[PDB]
Symmetry: D2
Amino acid sequence: NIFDVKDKYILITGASSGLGHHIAELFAKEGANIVICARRLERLKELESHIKNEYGVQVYTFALDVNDRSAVKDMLSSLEAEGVTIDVLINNAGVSDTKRFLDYNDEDWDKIVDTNLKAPWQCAQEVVQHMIKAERKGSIINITSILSQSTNLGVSPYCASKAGLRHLTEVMAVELARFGINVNAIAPGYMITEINEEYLTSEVGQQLLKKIPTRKFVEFDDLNGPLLLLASQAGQGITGIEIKVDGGHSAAP
Amino acid sequence: NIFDVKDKYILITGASSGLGHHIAELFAKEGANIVICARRLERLKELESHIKNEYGVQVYTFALDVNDRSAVKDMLSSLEAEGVTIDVLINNAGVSDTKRFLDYNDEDWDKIVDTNLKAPWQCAQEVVQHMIKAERKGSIINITSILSQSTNLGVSPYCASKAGLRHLTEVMAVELARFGINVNAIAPGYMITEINEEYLTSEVGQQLLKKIPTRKFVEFDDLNGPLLLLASQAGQGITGIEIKVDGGHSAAPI
Amino acid sequence: NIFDVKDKYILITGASSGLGHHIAELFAKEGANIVICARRLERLKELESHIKNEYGVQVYTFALDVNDRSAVKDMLSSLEAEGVTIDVLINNAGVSDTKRFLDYNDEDWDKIVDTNLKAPWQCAQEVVQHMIKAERKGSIINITSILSQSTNLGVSPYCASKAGLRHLTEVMAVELARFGINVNAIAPGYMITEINEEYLTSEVGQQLLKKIPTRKFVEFDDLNGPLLLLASQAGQGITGIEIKVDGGHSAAP
Amino acid sequence: NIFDVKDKYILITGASSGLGHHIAELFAKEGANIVICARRLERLKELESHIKNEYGVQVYTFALDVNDRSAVKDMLSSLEAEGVTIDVLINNAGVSDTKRFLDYNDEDWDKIVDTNLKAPWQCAQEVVQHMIKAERKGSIINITSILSQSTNLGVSPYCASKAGLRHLTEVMAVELARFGINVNAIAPGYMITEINEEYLTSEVGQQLLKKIPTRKFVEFDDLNGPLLLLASQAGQGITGIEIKVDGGHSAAP
């Protein structure tokens, strides 16, 4: 089995979102041990109990801000002291907003760009230090977005940040190959979530459906394949790429 | 198992190359039935026997020119009459040469471009008609090359044809979605093969190795994961993309 | 004046089209000499007179098929014997159609792909030999289309050939640089011309307008700048690129 | 003359660099008025006198940090109060460094990413408000780098920020079309300047020269054509693009 991730430790940021939950559950279901973090601890204790109960894998929870480097480092040290080495980092931290181009302020910018671009970078740096010390030839997966190359209205800093992370992915792959660490991205299209429930089920968003070739928004399960590929031996010869999962959304006329 | 291909029928063009053999053996090992074709049938006979004996799957062989539309059409008819419907087409036919930009002629151009771009298009058209006829929601995988976006010297018609195929993959993904058929590409880097042993093991090619981030040419095994992804349920939400498998070669420092 | 093209010889294939007429008139206006070819000599005679009369530059006409290498070569030899050396090749031969993906046949494929991709390649080879023989460091400009990276319905072989020509432009730049020849592309969006008046004035085309950021189809004049840039000293440090002229069409949400 | 910029006001950030001086002189030479800023007012005065003396155009200088949003805003208000309206914003702000991937710290990141990406975004926002207030249909030009899509070692945050700026250019193009403002980028390759004498004039860098198809580093003059195209009427039908000026470097094998 080339997609085997059993007994690995998967570190997942942005773990309290619907996507964060799905990812953790996917890897626990495949027999991987899970390290989940988010800003607020209470949402993770819940996910933790469920995962331990359903799958019996090891689960570690950490509350921290992904932009707090010393917090991430302190998380890794805490893991190292318990004898744990991270195999795969999944950078899934992400915030956005909807504002006209001229209405975004410096505060909006710092929040969106630091969360979507700076934080994955910091986290990758620290996890890589940790992997290198343990001589572990792991993997890094960046959750980007089709908005890293496609555009939409009202989401300018998000687009900027995603595009930055996509190119950073390529550069990281080039600079980290010497440590045997591959670095790749997965770019989802529009996923049906509650943060954009009003938007998608509306009539204006329903017209989007008719532009998307599969006539369907992205389901979490659509991500399963690429996630397992990029986190396992199956993906070891692959580095520096971005896999779009969008039902052809980005290729539409 | 979301990567399940058991009992599917996989159609593989260009099956007589080392890569084609590898692909055939990969899907057979995963319990899938195999349809292989190439120009010379005799080049397929060992593989058929190995596969029947070792994996116990169905194997159909066909001799044809990938540029012969009626031959492809006749093959598909023959499969239908045996109750066989193709689940996945893997377009893996590919030729090249090495010539200065100005030394390539009309004959070279027609050979390289018709084989690399026109034939996969013909096969896709015919396989799609066959799938539709059987009301089947299948998959198409185009083997391109990192040369669909990167350049090299002495391979201009190959680069043009691969970029052509890459964009056609995207266009087909859009136009075929209505039939439940997803269309994707795999772009290998330089694979350690025997048609290019001299190029790769030489001085000019050994300098190439140090440019590649992993400092390894592409192994056939590197392709297994993407192939299984794009041929199975795991990949159903994915259409119109090209997965590069190159150890970072195309990202390498300018 | 870095955009100077006075006294150059500009070779324009596809000269009988609306765009071809426009390009010819553009360069004549700038004091450049004009070599135009198309299949039917009579459509070029009107253009020839119009140009000779208004601008007083040299005009050479050739009736020939652009897919005929021997004809193209004889045209050049003919020019060489008169002491004329081409400075700029503008590859503007291009035909298309509108058919469902499964309705395009082998004949459609050959006409479309040979004219849009094979011919500019043949002409480029022949023009380059002509330049090399005269020890001349000229330019090649391939007219592609935004459909070289974007998609639309019913134009599958056109898209393939344009994407092919786009990458071919990059490869040619690399391979012809040693002869001092730069190679670039201009990719127009949907041009308000007479060859696609029905598509654009239809309702499927009116829905296009509100999607395009400038709310305008492309005017021929929008190409003037890129044409003069890539044909003059102004463009000498530029090779291997494709300039999109489309009012943001390829970036639209 | 479709490239006319006579009497326009061109706003140039990063004006104290070698490139900034060149851009100021280019536009002054073409009869356009110049608004230049840099951190230290003293570095701008030499240029100011030279331009006022040689071309006799209006020159306005401002000391500011391009990351200081309120200072940029005050500059524009100051200009508004004098009856001046900016026609073209040229974002020419850019800093970098050389460090292995894991050696870059939070302070480096902030300096590089805020200067290369956040600042042009702030300036663009402020300048658009200024244009809209004056009902003026101008242009924005972002100086990116071929490193917005290509990679190199030791420059990871620069790559991120430039890729960020590249996609932001496309997004802004879409969102600002409604105001008659086009947004484009110029991506130079490696420029032979005095600020980078060691990497380039040495032999370690000389192996790159053999990689570049033209065998030439980028000269400032190579940018002249694209700059005038994108700042004038010649470029009005163009929005959302990046013009690479690199002698085919990014296309190299």
